[PDB]
Design a protein around this ligand. Structure first.
Ligand SMILES: OC[C@H]1O[C@@H](O[C@H]2[C@@H](OC[C@H]3O[C@@H](O[C@H]4[C@H](O)[C@@H](O)[C@@H](O)O[C@@H]4CO)[C@H](O)[C@@H](O)[C@@H]3O[C@@H]3O[C@H](CO[C@H]4OC[C@@H](O)[C@H](O)[C@H]4O)[C@@H](O[C@@H]4O[C@H](CO[C@H]5OC[C@@H](O)[C@H](O)[C@H]5O)[C@@H](O)[C@H](O)[C@H]4O)[C@H](O)[C@H]3O)OC[C@@H](O)[C@@H]2O)[C@H](O)[C@@H](O)[C@H]1O
Ligand SMILES: OC[C@H]1O[C@@H](O)[C@H](O)[C@@H](O)[C@@H]1O[C@@H]1O[C@H](CO[C@H]2OC[C@@H](O)[C@H](O)[C@H]2O)[C@@H](O[C@@H]2O[C@H](CO[C@H]3OC[C@@H](O)[C@H](O)[C@H]3O)[C@@H](O[C@@H]3O[C@H](CO[C@H]4OC[C@@H](O)[C@H](O)[C@H]4O)[C@@H](O)[C@H](O)[C@H]3O)[C@H](O)[C@H]2O)[C@H](O)[C@H]1O
Ligand code: CL
Ligand code: CL
Ligand code: CL
Ligand code: CL
Ligand code: CL
Ligand code: CL
Ligand code: CL
Ligand code: CL
Ligand code: CL
Ligand code: CL
Ligand code: CL
Ligand code: CL
Ligand code: CL
Ligand code: CL
Ligand code: CL
Ligand code: CL
Ligand code: CL
Ligand code: CL
Ligand code: CL
Ligand code: CL
Ligand code: CL
Ligand code: CL
Ligand code: CL
Ligand code: CL
Ligand code: CL
Ligand code: CL
Ligand code: CL
Length: 685
């Protein structure tokens, strides 16, 4: 209720599906946005890692997820991202299906990178099916590790493999619990993400020594699974690790009693393969998915990977995703024309193996009846949001409009309703958006080119020219007639009085990735805060020229400063470790907000009833507590409106907080991998 998301649905890469082969619990992991449990009672995904603080953004990268065959309550994640928090890596252990976790930091022993090449391979973390206290973990670069205390500490088990050219190392670990001594499983199979050297190994002494067994080192394994009866190991492989490389591949099966490998590649098509699943009650019933194939014209509407099913252990196969399939959008209209790609994990639902889930670069798709002649695949992403949101606007009396990486963004009359369409044309992303305060039908967005709308985002027309380059931040004057624009990666802000028919430099040439801001009241006034110089630059001639204000707010803040409705000359600046300041006089002087020792982002929203100033929202540290705070009294007092369970890793790539201008208390925040989060902070009930 209080915490949620703008509805979009999936929109990023789910890198693995893991189900409990006895209880039927289903989970997934993602590369940039944590992990989820499928709540089959309520039919929605439940995020499990929204508690990660900004000191734990790293854990949004989930490299492996393991369940305990003997106890469905246990759940383990290997979490870490190379580029956050020093690459800090942990085993995250839960005894309650992910409702709560214990953190076991392992960085100095081994690291993980959820956004690595090879990330859909797995699972490289596994629980001994005979002994809940024993886990093994293959690592990308540090060998094979084990724990004998349920994941609390780890030791090096085997180092015959450590590093590989692709950085992905040991990429699956599978136990055969038919082989046991002293209550410790003795047979372990591992896969290694390399070609031209040994890459599938078997130990029969509990992981102390391994023997190479692969039939063809031209291909590296992605995933493997052992049938419930322990008789047959199925392996998907390709000549690259995926998800976005690999040009050919195979499916193999190993009959363990005789060590017999059979090439069961569907139709000898030799596509790159990643996903494989076996029915827990039928060794011979299997399904596979290609990974990084693109020549399947799914639904007749899109291009992506293939899915093949067999009931005879791979002797013959039937396609289960093709041009005759249909896409059930499940009320999420914008997914039409998109499909299943990077399909490096596929899973029969253990409770009913007529049902199959498959991953994709844009979410997860579910076929509830794999036996149908013309299969129906549902975009099955309720509760899941994985996009990287880059900008947004909230129009008083109008729509909320997002600018999103990969899935472009949408126009919302109800932010909790799934969009029928996303902004088109877009190339890759929209990274900036603006509207005219006194001409609210006029909106502009920045992709490879600028696009203008005269109907509040419903339709778009390209600017005649987009000066400098695309993807920059943008402002529209209050009257809508002037645009200011700084191309991404460039340091000059330009102005146009004709929707980009012509451009002229503002004279501001030294603010890289400038975020120009229009005053809401005075159509001739704009501001640019420069982190490098520490200056607030102000224009009173509609962008023709700027001057620095009398007093600098200070250096090294966020470029995303905010003007204030109904308050000409007011600007709030998030100063990072310099705190939070605001001016009411165009930067002639500044108020230091007491008790704010750090502020990463500031946004404005609808005023409280009976208040005289718009509400202010920050992501920052107030009296020593980092989180989301609201002030309804112009910064004199603050209240925390998030909680320790809802931090999401902080503001992430888009680095913004913004209030809704129509719904008091509602605030939006960007994230590294959880879409656009919302807090409905008006707790009046
Ligand atoms: O090229 C395609 C290829 O990419 C591989 O992945 C690697 C690649 O990732 C790019 C971005 O991935 C994107 O996620 C995708 C995801 O992969 C998809 O599967 C799917 O789910 O969609 C998402 C979204 O599209 C991430 O969103 C994106 O963040 C990744 O880009 C990296 O971002 C890091 C974090 O920073 C950004 O977010 C926090 C903000 O505060 C930052 O402003 C913003 O940059 C970047 O790291 C940051 O880098 C700066 C500067 O670093 C530089 O200067 C100092 C030197 O010491 C550094 O070495 C030097 O790089 C740091 O100051 C900062 O501390 C750090 O956090 C990062 O540079 C940027 O690339 O690229 C990074 C690899 O790690 C990924 O493996 C895929 O594997 C592959 O399949 C294919 O897609
Ligand atoms: O014509 C049909 C088909 O015929 C085959 O025979 C041919 O080989 C195919 O190329 C062709 O299909 C088209 O394939 C490309 C990929 O092509 C590359 O790989 C195969 C090579 O043969 C070829 O030479 C290569 O050029 C597909 O492109 C991929 O599309 C997906 C999905 O894109 C959709 O969703 C995002 C939206 O922005 C797009 O408009 C929409 O189409 C992309 O996946 C998303 O990627 C981003 C991360 O981006 C980055 O990593 C990969 C890199 O290529 C890209 O440039 C980077 O930006 C993630 O955040 C998303 O989560 C993920 O879903 C791929 O990035 C992209 O390569 C064509 O769609 C397909 O029609
Ligand atoms: Cl269900
Ligand atoms: Cl299991
Ligand atoms: Cl159980
Ligand atoms: Cl046990
Ligand atoms: Cl103990
Ligand atoms: Cl070593
Ligand atoms: Cl190698
Ligand atoms: Cl050995
Ligand atoms: Cl079986
Ligand atoms: Cl064997
Ligand atoms: Cl065949
Ligand atoms: Cl085929
Ligand atoms: Cl292909
Ligand atoms: Cl077929
Ligand atoms: Cl697609
Ligand atoms: Cl709304
Ligand atoms: Cl659309
Ligand atoms: Cl208006
Ligand atoms: Cl126009
Ligand atoms: Cl005006
Ligand atoms: Cl700057
Ligand atoms: Cl300064
Ligand atoms: Cl003024
Ligand atoms: Cl704002
Ligand atoms: Cl709390
Ligand atoms: Cl937390
Ligand atoms: Cl309240």
């Amino acid at each position: 209720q209080t915490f949620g998301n703008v509805a979009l649905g999936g929109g990023g890469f789910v890198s693995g599906i893991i189900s409990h082969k006895t209880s039927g619990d289903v989970y997934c992991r993602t590369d940039v946005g944590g992990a989820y449990r499928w709540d089959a009672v309520n039919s929605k995904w439940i995020p499990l890692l929204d508690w990660t603080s900004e000191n734990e953004t790293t854990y949004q990268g989930v490299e492996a997820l393991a369940l305990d065959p003997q106890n469905a309550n246990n759940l383990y994640l290997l979490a870490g991202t190379a580029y956050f928090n020093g690459g800090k890596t942990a085993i995250l252990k839960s005894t309650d299906k992910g409702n709560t976790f214990t953190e076991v930091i392992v960085t100095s022993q081994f690291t993980a990178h959820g956004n690595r090449l090879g990330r859909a391979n797995g699972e490289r973390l596994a629980v001994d099916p005979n002994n809940s206290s024993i886990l093994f973990c293959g690592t990308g670069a540090n060998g094979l590790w084990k724990s004998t205390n349920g994941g609390l500490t780890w030791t090096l088990a085997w180092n015959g493999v450590t590093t590989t050219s692709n950085g992905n190392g040991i990429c699956f670990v599978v136990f055969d619990p038919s082989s046991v001594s002293g209550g410790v499983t003795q047979t372990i199979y591992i896969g290694v993400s390399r070609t031209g050297a040994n890459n599938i190994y078997k130990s029969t002494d509990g992981g102390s020594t391994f023997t190479a067994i692969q039939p063809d080192n031209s291909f590296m394994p992605h995933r493997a699974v052992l049938s419930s009866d322990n008789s047959t190991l199925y392996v998907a492989m390709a000549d690259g690790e995926g998800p976005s490389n690999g040009g050919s591949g195979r499916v193999y099966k190993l009959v363990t009693a005789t060590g017999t490998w059979t090439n069961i590649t569907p139709n000898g098509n030799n596509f790159p393969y990643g996903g494989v699943s076996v029915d827990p009650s039928n060794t011979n019933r299997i399904i596979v998915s290609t990974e990084n194939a693109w020549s399947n014209n799914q639904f007749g509407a899109t291009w992506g990977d293939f899915v093949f099913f067999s009931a005879n252990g791979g002797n013959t196969w039937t396609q289960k995703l093709s041009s005759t399939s249909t896409l059930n959008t499940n009320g999420i209209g914008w997914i039409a024309g998109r499909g299943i790609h990077w399909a490096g994990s596929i899973d029969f639902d253990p409770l009913n193996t007529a049902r199959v889930r498959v991953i994709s670069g844009n979410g997860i798709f579910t076929c509830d009846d794999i036996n149908a002649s013309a299969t129906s695949w549902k975009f099955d992403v309720k509760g899941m949001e994985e996009t990287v949101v880059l900008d947004a606007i909230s129009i008083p009396g109008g729509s909320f409009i997002s600018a999103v990486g990969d899935q472009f963004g949408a126009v919302y009359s109800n932010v909790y309703a799934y969009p029928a369409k996303v902004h088109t044309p877009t190339v890759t992303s929209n990274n900036g958006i603006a509207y005219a305060a006194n001409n609210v039908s006029k909106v502009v967005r920045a992709t490879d080119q600028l696009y203008y709308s005269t109907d509040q985002g419903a339709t778009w027309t390209a600017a005649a020219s987009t000066i400098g380059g695309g993807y920059g931040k943008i402002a529209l004057s209050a009257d809508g007639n002037t645009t200011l624009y700084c191309p991404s990666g460039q340091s000059t802000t330009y102005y146009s009085t004709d929707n980009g028919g012509s451009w002229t430099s503002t004279g501001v040439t030294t603010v890289q990735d400038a975020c120009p801001i229009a005053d809401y009241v005075n159509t001739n006034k704009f501001y640019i805060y420069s982190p490098t110089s520490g200056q607030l630059l102000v224009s009173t001639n509609k962008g023709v020229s700027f001057t620095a204000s009398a007093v600098n707010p200070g250096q090294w803040g966020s470029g995303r400063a905010r003007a204030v409705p109904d308050n000409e000359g007011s600007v709030w600046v998030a100063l990072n470790g310099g705190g939070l300041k605001y001016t009411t006089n165009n930067g002639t002087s500044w108020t230091t907000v007491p008790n704010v020792s750090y502020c990463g982002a500031v946004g404005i929203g609808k005023a409280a009833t009976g208040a005289t100033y718009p509400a202010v929202y920050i992501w920052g540290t107030v009296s020593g507590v980092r989180g989301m705070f609201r002030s309804t009294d112009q910064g004199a007092s603050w209240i925390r409106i998030n909680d320790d369970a809802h931090e999401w890793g902080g503001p992430g790539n888009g680095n913004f907080v913004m209030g809704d201008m129509n719904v008091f208390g509602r605030v939006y925040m960007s994230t590294v991998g959880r879409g656009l989060v919302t807090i409905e902070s008006d707790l009046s009930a």
